[PDB]
């Protein structure tokens, strides 16, 4: 009941060019970055906003509103090493291909859409932590500097934030325990708004409501409140 | 237009708390719910404003409109069998043969309207014949041995082959063996278009071909044919039987004939099946509906197609202490006494009514038609469905015969369904009423008189109505001038005979305008 | 009138089937039916493919030859023979 | 609860009486997926993003990395182009012998709670 | 002067010349046969 | 000089949906492409 | 993918028929680089900053500190004055014993992603 089942996979960071026109999916691949050490820990946060004034005419607790939903966040930890080949520039070159994710890209700048490249954190079946995201900040620490100036060991932090992917572009079977008035409450929340259900369906006698029929419940467009 | 409104909110009826009767001080949790459970008034009031669809059906009867009734489709069902042994009634009337059923929908089921009989019909006399060579009392041309010459080895119009058919069953499929010694250049069987007849009592009637080894008998063939009606051969000899004539037409340019036709050696006739027509009908059994509410005006619906017109179809049985009481369907209720057990059934839909009740003047509840007591179970014993458009079955679709009662194995239809017409809906009839209710039908003025002739016969070009002038006999009646159409030749001239109208054309016009004429006017069509 | 109706037995440089997606091209009814729609739209692509010849007087249909004469004043009145008009317009 | 509508069918056919047959219900939403997953992101230039970039991943190694990218690829597309359906997990399983990757998708029309899996019956 | 002599009503319906769908006025596929775009 | 214009962009051809014929309620994932694939106009 | 244009050629020859021949394509890029890197800054008084300043790092010790500054000098100048060229690493290898400093520049015209190295053929 598995795919590869018994194999080890290295996490890699995929960088995509930003969308140009009226598009939402990221464009073609520009550089795929394979890790040298999978992250030890991977923090994911999520915040919501609910403004809540404390006053009223009676100063009882007031029902708060839903101002909006903040985007998801990650904090990776990127490690590189070339300590077995001092004097090599594998780490310095690799980090360079990692700092492309904080500056505008030439192709987009030509089309007057100056956005830095989008990234995706692909790692196996880790579905929770894989979405279209942009890089926020890259704080990099360099250690174990090899002779002749090339760095060797570099720790790179990442802050990722999810980019929404929106714009993905009413029939009920009457059961013996159901009734017209209860059906209004189930979908609309108003007990005495049942008149709308019979209006669209055209049923004139609310007494019978034959079992097994199909009813079309219109949206709230008939009651804009 | 200017429609009154009859809606008051459900909550508003509760506002009559009216706590002006001293000792009553309560809230929702109580037993004052009789003030609330009487909210049924809101359900009542919502029913007041609605005008039900059933009323628009009653209105059409009031203004003399007849709803369009539905029909069905008739096809050509053919049976098939491989054991031609004897004769008997192997097809009871109403034998059901249905289309194949798959993932979609319940297959459309047909039903034969006649009884079919099959018998392995044998043959009589094989007689030599050519164009102009009558039988002349000859029967034994191939009685024992040798052979009988086919059209004197020369096929021309007027030729025929003389055979016999012992039974000549009007609706059977017959197979004839045609064994011929091969002589001359071989030909394609389809190349000669030989016409086959039967010599019906009304005269010569054609027949179709469903085999390859027919006519062009470069090999001993076996022609099969379905018999087209009852008939007997021209009895001159010693075999009073049916007839099959292998008549030969003229040699077409693209379908040519060949001299030196093969000579028949042996021949035998066997039946293989029978052909009959069926209507889109089906008889369902034991469709229970529910329990009666014991109230006047009960209405029940059947979850199936419109019932098919005929003998009283919807048979309603209701539970009673004695047993299953029988309800007989009746036409429009009219004068139905309370003792009578009568129901009303819609032909084009499953809506079935019951005895309605009315009150007037002195009061009372004068009721037309009986009412089933409370708790009685009502079940539809047996009724016939089948009417509707969904009977326009594709050619050759029907393959399964229901219940496999007879010896028969294969059933197919060679021709597509004629095509039924689905009954009109009430919504459709609402559009017809403004039009069909004011279609003249009086012929009062000059415009109508010339217009009505066009409707009576659109084949005419110019029609005008001119009244008989003064000092003219006929009681000031009218004259009509009719101009039949005619292409005036490529030569630019038109014969006079092309201008006179046909007598039938004058007949159809005169017959229609006679009924819609006014009381004191006569008419006489004719060319000017 | 001119009776410039559809023509039987004419292909197209833009088959409807050839623009259909993959996998779709596996059906039997879809390929046959949608090919039928090509019949009605076939001759329109012919005149668009061959429009240069529709203006050369030496080859263009007779109707336009009289029309082409009016472009350069060919004095086409009185001629009821097609081949006589063919030389006049080109040489006008 | 969600309305499913009606339409044509992928392998189209004359029907019982003629014309072309129209199918609705749970069968229909099963047909829309077959079109969606079969076509590559192309071969319909007016609508390029429609399809499934399954084929660009062909011939990758058989690792959970390939299986991982598969899950994200089907999930976005089924959400973008077919919204009358709620998707319940995708299953990638080795078939005969470390050779081919079977994508098993379990789904249900929104609000109905009728688990079902795409089969792709040839 | 005229390149075409057709109109919206001019529908040929030559699918029977290839296929066997045999409804003059079906519910649906006639609509698909209706192509004003020509 | 004074030239007629003969452009009618592609999108406003699919605007011909006309869902005023019964029993056809379909969206992007529908075998209605014969409408779209006739974009050759 | 990026337009390269056409122009004259550094060692200009009369050509097949006369005049002066014109070179375009990937070949033309070499001449633009050959001019850019050969001349020191200040050779053309009107445009002083043009011309890579290699000679400021002559007679420096043979250390990767010198090769370190060499890399920067090419990178800025090769980018400032030749924008059609995307540069891919510069290699500083001594060779022939530590007395000379070779420079190997790998580049590619944008989008074409055809790797290429300037050779400077005499």
Rounded to the nearest angstrom, the minimum Cα separation between E32 and chain D is 11
Are residues B264 and B126 in contact, defined by beta-carbon separation less than 8 angstroms?
Answer: yes
User: How many CA atoms are closer than 13 Å to the CA of B426, on its beta-carbon side?
Assistant: 12
Rounded to the nearest angstrom, the minimum Cα separation between D111 and chain E is 29
Q: Which helix (H) or strand (E) holds A62?
A: none
- Judging contact as 3 or more Cβ pairs under 8 Å, the answer for A and B is yes
B160-170 b/e (C-beta count within 10 Å ≥ 16 → b): bbbbbbbbbbb
Instruction: Spell out which residues of chain F touch residue C17, defining contact as CB-CB under 8 Å.
Output: none
> Any CB–CB contact under 8 A between E7 and chain F?
no
Name the resolution in angstroms: 3.5
Rounded to the nearest angstrom, the minimum Cα separation between C20 and chain F is 7
Q: Which chains sit next to E, with 3 or more Cβ pairs under 8 A?
A: C, D, F
Residues B117, B128: Cα–Cα separation, whole Å: 32
Structure-token match 């669809």, residue found: B53
Candidates D32, D48, D67: best to mutate against A (most CBs of A within 10 A) is D67
Residues B302, B317: Cα–Cα separation, whole Å: 14
Are residues B340 and B369 in contact, defined by beta-carbon separation less than 8 angstroms?
Answer: yes
> Any CB–CB contact under 8 A between E20 and chain D?
yes
Candidates B6, B7, B10, B54: best to mutate against A (most CBs of A within 10 A) is B10
* Minimal-distance CA residue of chain A relative to B7: A195
Q: What is the 3-state secondary structure (H, E, C) of B193-224?
A: CEEEECCECCECCEECCCCCCCCCCCCCEEEE
Helix, strand and coil percent figures for chain E, each rounded to 5: 15, 0, 85
- Inter-chain residue contact D12 with C33, CB threshold 8 Å: yes
Comparing CB atoms, the residue among C4, C29, C35 nearest residue E5 is C4
Phi-psi region of B512 (alpha: psi -120 to 50; beta: other; left: phi over 0): alpha
| Residues paired with B292 in a beta bridge | none
Comparing CB atoms, the residue among D63, D71, D93 nearest residue A9 is D63
- Inter-chain residue contact C34 with F40, CB threshold 8 Å: no
Residues C60, C65: Cα–Cα separation, whole Å: 7
Residues B528, B462: Cα–Cα separation, whole Å: 11
Residues B261, B186: Cα–Cα separation, whole Å: 10
Biggest alpha carbon–alpha carbon distance for chain E: 39
Residues F31, E32: Cα–Cα separation, whole Å: 11
Computed on alpha carbons and rounded to an integer, the radius of gyration of chain F in Å comes to 14
- Beta-sheet strands, E only, within B141-268: 172-181, 194-197, 206-207, 221-226, 245-248, 263-266
Residues B514, G107: Cα–Cα separation, whole Å: 102
G64-90 b/e (C-beta count within 10 Å ≥ 16 → b): eebbeebeebbeebbeebbeebbeeeb
Are residues B33 and B384 in contact, defined by beta-carbon separation less than 8 angstroms?
Answer: no
**Pairing between β-strand A73-80 and β-strand D23-24 as defined by DSSP bridges:** unpaired
- Inter-chain residue contact D19 with E20, CB threshold 8 Å: no
**Pairing between β-strand A153-162 and β-strand A140-143 as defined by DSSP bridges:** antiparallel
Residues D27, D5: Cα–Cα separation, whole Å: 11
DSSP 3-state of B496: helix
> Any CB–CB contact under 8 A between G117 and chain A?
no
DSSP state of C21: P
Biggest alpha carbon–alpha carbon distance for chain F: 50
| Relative orientation angle of helices D64-81 and D26-38, to the nearest 10 degrees | 120
DSSP state of C18: G
Rounded to the nearest angstrom, the minimum Cα separation between A148 and chain G is 6
Structure tokens at B86: 């004897």
Residues B278, B397: Cα–Cα separation, whole Å: 14
Q: Which helix (H) or strand (E) holds G85?
A: strand G85-93
Which residues, in sequence order, are CB contacts of B254 under 8 Å at separation 6+? none
Residues D70, D33: Cα–Cα separation, whole Å: 16
**Pairing between β-strand A133-135 and β-strand B111-112 as defined by DSSP bridges:** unpaired
Are residues B340 and B368 in contact, defined by beta-carbon separation less than 8 angstroms?
Answer: no
Taking a contact as any Cβ pair under 8 Å apart, which residues of chain A between 33 and 72 contact chain G?
Answer: none
Which residues, in sequence order, are CB contacts of G96 under 8 Å at separation 6+? none
> Any CB–CB contact under 8 A between F35 and chain E?
yes
Comparing CB atoms, the residue among E20, E27, E30 nearest residue D14 is E20
Structure-token match 């045999």, residue found: E22
Instruction: Spell out which residues of chain D touch residue B104, defining contact as CB-CB under 8 Å.
Output: 16, 21, 23
Are residues B420 and B73 in contact, defined by beta-carbon separation less than 8 angstroms?
Answer: yes
Rounded to the nearest angstrom, the minimum Cα separation between D52 and chain F is 13
Q: What angle do CA B478, B479, B481 make, to 5 degrees?
A: 150
Are residues B112 and B91 in contact, defined by beta-carbon separation less than 8 angstroms?
Answer: yes
- Beta-sheet strands, E only, within B324-402: 324-329, 342-343, 377-385, 398-401
DSSP 3-state of B371: coil
Residues B129, B161: Cα–Cα separation, whole Å: 6
If one counts every other C-beta atom within 10 angstroms of the C-beta of residue B350, the result is 19
- Inter-chain residue contact E3 with C35, CB threshold 8 Å: no
Of the candidates A214, C20, B472, the one whose C-alpha atom is nearest the C-alpha of residue D5 is: A214
Structure tokens at B238: 């010693």
* Minimal-distance CA residue of chain E relative to F22: E27
Experimental method: cryo-EM
Q: Cα-flanking dihedrals φ and ψ of residue C65, to 5°?
A: -60, -45
Which residues, in sequence order, are CB contacts of B487 under 8 Å at separation 6+? none
> Any CB–CB contact under 8 A between C3 and chain E?
yes
Structure tokens at B493: 């001239």
Q: Which chains sit next to G, with 3 or more Cβ pairs under 8 A?
A: A
Instruction: Spell out which residues of chain C touch residue F33, defining contact as CB-CB under 8 Å.
Output: 20-21, 24
Are residues A91 and A109 in contact, defined by beta-carbon separation less than 8 angstroms?
Answer: no
Structure tokens at B323: 């047993």
**Pairing between β-strand B377-385 and β-strand B316-319 as defined by DSSP bridges:** antiparallel
- Inter-chain residue contact E37 with F41, CB threshold 8 Å: yes
If one counts every other C-beta atom within 10 angstroms of the C-beta of residue A127, the result is 14
Residues A96, A107: Cα–Cα separation, whole Å: 19
DSSP 3-state of B126: strand
Instruction: Spell out which residues of chain D touch residue B397, defining contact as CB-CB under 8 Å.
Output: 16
DSSP 3-state of A42: coil
Instruction: Spell out which residues of chain A touch residue D4, defining contact as CB-CB under 8 Å.
Output: 171
Residues B287, B377: Cα–Cα separation, whole Å: 12
CB neighbour class for B243 (10 Å; exposed up to 12, middle 13-18, buried from 19): buried
- Inter-chain residue contact D7 with F25, CB threshold 8 Å: yes
Residues B474, E37: Cα–Cα separation, whole Å: 61
Are residues A120 and A132 in contact, defined by beta-carbon separation less than 8 angstroms?
Answer: yes
* Minimal-distance CA residue of chain B relative to A207: B43
Which residues, in sequence order, are CB contacts of D90 under 8 Å at separation 6+? D70, D71, D74, D75, D103, D104, D105, D106
C-alpha distances out from residue B243 to B123, B200, B206, B292, Å: 9, 8, 11, 63
Are residues B111 and B282 in contact, defined by beta-carbon separation less than 8 angstroms?
Answer: yes
**Pairing between β-strand B263-266 and β-strand B398-401 as defined by DSSP bridges:** unpaired
| Relative orientation angle of helices B503-515 and B446-456, to the nearest 10 degrees | 130
- Inter-chain residue contact E26 with D22, CB threshold 8 Å: no
Residues F13, A115: Cα–Cα separation, whole Å: 34
Structure-token match 């510069």, residue found: G90
Of the candidates A92, A77, A79, A78, the one whose C-alpha atom is nearest the C-alpha of residue A146 is: A92
Instruction: Spell out which residues of chain C touch residue D12, defining contact as CB-CB under 8 Å.
Output: 27, 29-30, 33
* Minimal-distance CA residue of chain E relative to D22: E28
A85-94, Cβ contacts within 8 angstroms, sequence gap of 24 or more: A86/A146, A86/A147, A86/A152, A87/A146, A87/A147, A87/A148, A87/A150, A88/A146, A88/A150, A89/A150, A91/A150, A91/A151, A91/A152, A91/A153, A91/A154, A92/A150, A92/A151, A92/A154, A94/A33, A94/A36
Instruction: Spell out which residues of chain E touch residue C51, defining contact as CB-CB under 8 Å.
Output: none
* Minimal-distance CA residue of chain F relative to E35: F35
Of the candidates B512, B509, B506, B508, the one whose C-alpha atom is nearest the C-alpha of residue B526 is: B506
Rounded to the nearest angstrom, the minimum Cα separation between D87 and chain F is 16
First to last CA, chain B: 51
First to last CA, chain A: 50
Instruction: Spell out which residues of chain B touch residue D16, defining contact as CB-CB under 8 Å.
Output: 99, 104-105, 108, 390, 393-394, 397
> Any CB–CB contact under 8 A between B46 and chain A?
yes
Comparing CB atoms, the residue among D9, D22, D32 nearest residue F29 is D32
C-alpha distances out from residue C10 to B242, B436, C36, C39, E12, Å: 53, 48, 12, 7, 14
Instruction: Spell out which residues of chain D touch residue E21, defining contact as CB-CB under 8 Å.
Output: 14, 18-20
DSSP state of B145: S
> Any CB–CB contact under 8 A between E17 and chain D?
no
C-alpha distances out from residue B502 to B63, B456, B523, B525, Å: 39, 15, 17, 11
| Relative orientation angle of helices G64-80 and G25-38, to the nearest 10 degrees | 120
Helices (H), B292-424: none
Candidates E29, E37, E38: best to mutate against F (most CBs of F within 10 A) is E37
| Relative orientation angle of helices C62-71 and C82-91, to the nearest 10 degrees | 30
Instruction: Spell out which residues of chain F touch residue E29, defining contact as CB-CB under 8 Å.
Output: none
Instruction: Spell out which residues of chain E touch residue F35, defining contact as CB-CB under 8 Å.
Output: 32
- Inter-chain residue contact C37 with F34, CB threshold 8 Å: yes
If one counts every other C-beta atom within 10 angstroms of the C-beta of residue G97, the result is 7
Of the candidates B352, B387, B381, B379, the one whose C-alpha atom is nearest the C-alpha of residue B282 is: B387
Q: What is the 3-state secondary structure (H, E, C) of B241-309?
A: CECCEEEECCCCCCCCCCCCCCEEEECCEEEEEEEEEEECCEEEEEEEEEECCCCCCCCECCCCCCECC
Candidates F15, F30, F37: best to mutate against D (most CBs of D within 10 A) is F30
């Amino acid at each position: 009941s598995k795919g590869a089942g018994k194999s080890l996979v290295r996490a890699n960071l995929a960088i995509h060019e930003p969308p140009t026109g009226k598009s939402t999916s990221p464009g073609g691949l520009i550089k795929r970055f394979p890790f040298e050490f999978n992250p030890a820990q991977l923090s994911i946060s999520q915040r919501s906003q609910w403004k809540a004034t404390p006053t009223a005419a009676v100063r009882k607790a007031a029902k708060p509103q839903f101002m909006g939903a903040e985007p998801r966040e990650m904090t990776l930890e990127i490690f590189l090493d070339s300590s077995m080949k001092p004097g090599g520039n594998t780490v310095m070159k690799k980090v360079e291909s990692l700092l492309i994710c904080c500056e505008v890209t030439a192709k987009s700048l030509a089309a007057k859409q100056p956005s830095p490249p989008w990234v995706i954190f692909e790692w196996g079946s880790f579905s929770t932590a894989r979405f279209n995201a942009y890089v926020a900040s890259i704080e990099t620490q360099y250690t174990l500097f090899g002779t002749a100036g090339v760095p060797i060991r570099a720790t790179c932090q990442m802050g990722l934030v999810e980019i929404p992917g929106p714009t993905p572009n009413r029939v009920h079977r009457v059961v013996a325990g159901d009734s017209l008035q209860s059906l209004a409450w189930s979908e609309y929340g108003s007990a005495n708004a049942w008149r709308v259900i019979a209006e669209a369906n055209g049923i004139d006698d609310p007494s019978h409501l034959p079992t097994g029929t199909e009813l079309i419940l219109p949206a709230t467009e008939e009651v804009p409140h | 237009r200017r429609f009154q409104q009859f809606v008051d909110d459900a909550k508003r009826y509760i506002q009559q708390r009216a706590p002006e009767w001293t000792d009553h001080n309560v809230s929702d949790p109580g037993v004052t719910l009789v003030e609330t459970v009487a909210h049924m008034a809101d359900q009542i009031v919502y029913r007041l404003n609605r005008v039900p669809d059933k009323n628009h059906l009653a209105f059409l009867d009031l203004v003399g409109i007849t709803l369009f009734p539905p029909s069905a489709a008739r096809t050509d069902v053919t049976f098939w069998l491989s054991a031609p042994q004897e004769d008997a009634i192997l097809v009871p009337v109403g034998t059901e043969v249905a289309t194949l059923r798959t993932e979609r929908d319940e297959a459309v089921v047909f039903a034969t309207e006649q009884d079919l009989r099959i018998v392995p019909c044998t043959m009589g006399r094989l007689v030599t014949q050519v164009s102009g060579e009558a039988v002349s009392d000859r029967t034994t041309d191939l009685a024992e041995s040798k052979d009988v010459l086919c059209f004197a080895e020369a096929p021309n119009p007027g030729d025929c082959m003389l055979i016999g058919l012992s039974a000549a069953v009007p609706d059977c499929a017959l197979a004839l063996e045609l064994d011929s010694r091969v002589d001359g250049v071989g030909v394609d069987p389809r190349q000669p278009p030989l016409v086959w007849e039967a010599w019906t009592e009304d005269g010569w009637q054609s027949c179709e071909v469903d085999r390859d080894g027919t006519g062009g008998l470069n090999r001993p063939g076996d022609v099969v044919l379905h018999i087209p009606g009852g008939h007997v051969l021209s009895r001159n000899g010693g075999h009073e039987a049916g007839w099959i004539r292998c008549r030969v037409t003229e040699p077409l340019s693209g379908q040519p004939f060949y001299t030196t036709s093969p000579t028949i050696r042996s021949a035998e006739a066997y039946t293989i099946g029978g052909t009959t027509g069926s209507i889109h009908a089906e008889t369902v059994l034991d469709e229970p509906l529910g329990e009666s509410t014991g109230l006047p005006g009960q209405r029940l619906r059947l979850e199936h197609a419109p019932v098919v017109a005929g003998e009283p179809s919807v048979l309603l049985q209701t539970a009673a202490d004695d047993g299953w009481q029988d309800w007989q369907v009746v036409p429009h209720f009219s004068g139905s006494h309370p003792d009578d057990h009568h129901i009303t059934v819609d032909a084009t839909t499953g809506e079935i009514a019951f005895g309605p009740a009315v009150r007037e003047a002195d009061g009372t509840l004068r009721q037309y038609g009986a009412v089933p007591p409370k708790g009685a179970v009502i079940r539809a014993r047996r009724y016939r469905t089948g009417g509707g458009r969904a009977g326009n079955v594709a050619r050759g679709a029907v393959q399964v015969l229901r219940t496999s009662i007879p010896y028969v194995s294969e059933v197919v239809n060679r021709e597509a369904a004629l095509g039924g017409v689905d009954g009109e809906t009430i919504e459709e009839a609402k559009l017809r009423a403004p039009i069909t209710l004011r279609a003249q039908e009086r012929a009062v003025t000059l415009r109508d008189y010339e217009e009505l002739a066009r409707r009576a016969a659109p084949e005419t070009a110019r029609i005008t109505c001119l009244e008989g002038a003064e000092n003219e006999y006929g009681a000031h009646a009218v004259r009509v001038l009719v101009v039949p159409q005619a292409v005036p030749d490529p030569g630019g001239r038109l014969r006079f005979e092309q201008l006179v109208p046909g007598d039938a054309l004058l007949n159809r016009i005169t017959r229609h305008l006679d009924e819609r004429r006014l009381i004191g006017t006569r008419l006489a069509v004719g060319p000017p | 009138a001119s009776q410039r109706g559809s023509v039987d037995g004419l292909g197209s440089s833009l088959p409807i089937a050839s623009m259909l997606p993959a996998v779709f091209a596996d059906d039997d009814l879809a390929l046959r039916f949608v090919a039928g729609l090509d019949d009605v739209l076939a001759p329109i692509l012919n005149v668009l493919d061959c429009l240069d010849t529709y203006f050369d007087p030496a080859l263009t249909p007779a109707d336009f030859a009289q029309w082409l004469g009016t472009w350069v004043g060919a004095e086409t009145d009185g001629t009821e023979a097609e081949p006589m008009l063919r030389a006049a317009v080109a040489a006008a | 609860e969600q309305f499913v509508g009606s339409g044509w069918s992928f392998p189209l056919r004359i029907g019982p009486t003629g014309g072309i047959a129209l199918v609705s219900g749970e069968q229909e939403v099963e047909e829309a997926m077959r079109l969606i997953l079969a076509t590559a992101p192309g071969e319909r230039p007016m609508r390029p993003e429609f399809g499934c970039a399954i084929h660009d991943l062909v011939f990758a190694p058989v690792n959970e990395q390939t299986a991982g990218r598969i899950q994200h690829e089907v999930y976005v597309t089924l959400d973008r182009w077919e919204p009358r359906i709620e998707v319940h997990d995708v299953d990638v399983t080795t078939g005969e012998e470390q050779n081919v990757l079977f994508i098993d998708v379990r789904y249900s029309i929104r609000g109905t709670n009728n688990p079902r899996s795409l089969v792709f019956p040839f």
